[model samples]
Target: KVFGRCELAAAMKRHGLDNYRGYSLGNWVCAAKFESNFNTQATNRNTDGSTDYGILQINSRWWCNDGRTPGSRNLCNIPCSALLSSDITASVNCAKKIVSDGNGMNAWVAWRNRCKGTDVQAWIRGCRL
Candidate 1:
């Protein structure tokens, strides 16, 4: 499902992304905007042939196992297909792992380039948090 801006905010907050790992939920919201536009089924193939999946664009090389990405660590211990589900529970949970493992939100390049060092609150201004 493609979530509305405020709707995605609420969902990410519900999953405890608010201020997680010192990165505000707005940071996450911003990343999702450029990463997948809040679309749960989004996927992209990297030059390395690994795929990024879902709203947060979790990578197949390290995060999820797609049975196709070479040398996948499957750190999230989940199938890459699970990241594409409309229900974001698995996706969010795995993202939590990504951050907690010291990758930080910058694991997403979109966040590093676009959302970092910016006023991320603009990403969620109209949302009633």
Candidate 2:
């Protein structure tokens, strides 16, 4: 989701993410923006000592592995490294499921903190989907 990777909205819509799981397309993009700024190689260490992986910031505690140890719950059942690729298909797919499992848009703290309200259209302003 880098600036030139693809038309942001188009890439998302192509993946059946627009309006999927009752969440808005802009929310997804906006959440991704804050979580990782759309960098596929993104990783963050939380204060709790678990790590977040990839664009959606799926956590080692429940969604993805920390990639340095064993026995994580890894709710998405994916290796943390699997989410770090430049191709975002796996990340998008994993996020879609997270949305479906009762999280909706709230699964991402960024969505709660920054994208819940306000002008969401800015997230996809010039993108065609």
Q: Best TM-score goes to which candidate?
A: 1
lDDT against the true structure, per candidate, is 0.92, 0.77
Among the numbered candidates, top lDDT falls to: 1
User: Per-residue lDDT for 2-86 in model 1, tens only?
Assistant: 9998899999999999998888888999999999999999999988999999999999999999999889999999999999998
Model 2 Cα lDDT, one tens digit per residue, 23-111: 77787788878888878788898777788888788878777876664457877788888989877788888888788878678878789
For model 2, the local distance difference test gives 0.77
Cα TM-score of candidate 2: 0.87
Residues forming the 10-long window of minimal summed lDDT in candidate 1: 100-109
For every model shown, what is its TM-score relative to the native structure? Answer: 0.96, 0.87
